[PDB]
């Protein structure tokens, strides 16, 4: 069993940072079986593929991967950007226990089969900082 979840619920980075590194924490004791969780960024209040990247991929939790790090590319849009953020959601949990990709309901999963130990919403608030005369609106 492995609960996959974001270390933080909100991540902030500069637009000029290049990438934002998020960390997924994995709990459940010990588990060396390879757990796969699929992720993508959500447009939220912006556009993925226009403002910042969608970094759609799958996180491979290998033996030793008690934590995983993902990075979202920031795209060069320079618009007056006020609290321009997106949401990272996790979905599609698949477990490699057998040598086949389709692990038939194998008990080395997240919860029941799949779930996530977060909203799951890792809000990535990009600090444009260029025209960012932002106001703190609570999420
Ligand atoms: Ca933007
Ligand atoms: Ca900007």
Swiss-Prot record:
* The protein's name: Sodium/calcium exchanger 1
Which tissues express it?
Cardiac sarcolemma (at protein level).
Q: Which residues bind Ca(2+) 4?
A: 51, 77, 81, 84
**Residues annotated for Ca(2+) 1 binding in this entry:** 15, 51, 77, 81
Annotated Ca(2+) 2 binding sites: 15, 76-77, 129-130
Q: Where in the cell is it found?
A: Cell membrane; Cell membrane, Sarcolemma
- Species of origin reads Canis lupus familiaris (Dog)
Positions bound to Ca(2+) 3: 15, 77, 79, 81, 128, 130
Spell out the family assignment given in the record's similarity comment.
Belongs to the Ca(2+):cation antiporter (CaCA) (TC 2.A.19) family. SLC8 subfamily.
User: Which ranges carry the Calx-beta domain?
Assistant: 1-91
Q: What does this protein do?
A: Mediates the exchange of one Ca(2+) ion against three to four Na(+) ions across the cell membrane, and thereby contributes to the regulation of cytoplasmic Ca(2+) levels and Ca(2+)-dependent cellular processes. Contributes to Ca(2+) transport during excitation-contraction coupling in muscle. In a first phase, voltage-gated channels mediate the rapid increase of cytoplasmic Ca(2+) levels due to release of Ca(2+) stores from the endoplasmic reticulum. SLC8A1 mediates the export of Ca(2+) from the cell during the next phase, so that cytoplasmic Ca(2+) levels rapidly return to baseline.
Domain remarks: The cytoplasmic Calx-beta domains bind the regulatory Ca(2+). The first Calx-beta domain can bind up to four Ca(2+) ions. The second domain can bind another two Ca(2+) ions that are essential for calcium-regulated ion exchange.
């Amino acid at each position: 069993v492995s609960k996959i979840f974001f270390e933080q619920g909100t991540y902030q980075c500069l637009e000029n940072c290049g990438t934002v590194a998020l960390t997924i924490i994995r709990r459940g004791g010990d588990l060396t079986n390879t757990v796969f969780v699929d992720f993508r960024t959500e447009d939220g209040t912006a556009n993925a593929g226009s403002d910042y990247e969608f970094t759609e991929g799958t996180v491979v939790f290998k033996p030793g991967e008690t934590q995983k790090e993902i990075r979202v590319g920031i795209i060069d849009d320079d618009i007056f950007e006020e609290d321009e953020n997106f949401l990272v959601h996790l979905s599609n949990v698949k477990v490699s226990s057998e040598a086949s990709e389709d692990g038939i309901l194998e008990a080395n999963h997240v919860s029941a089969l799949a779930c996530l130990g977060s909203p799951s919403t890792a809000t990535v608030t990009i600090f444009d900082d260029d025209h960012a005369g932002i106001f703190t609106f609570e999420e």
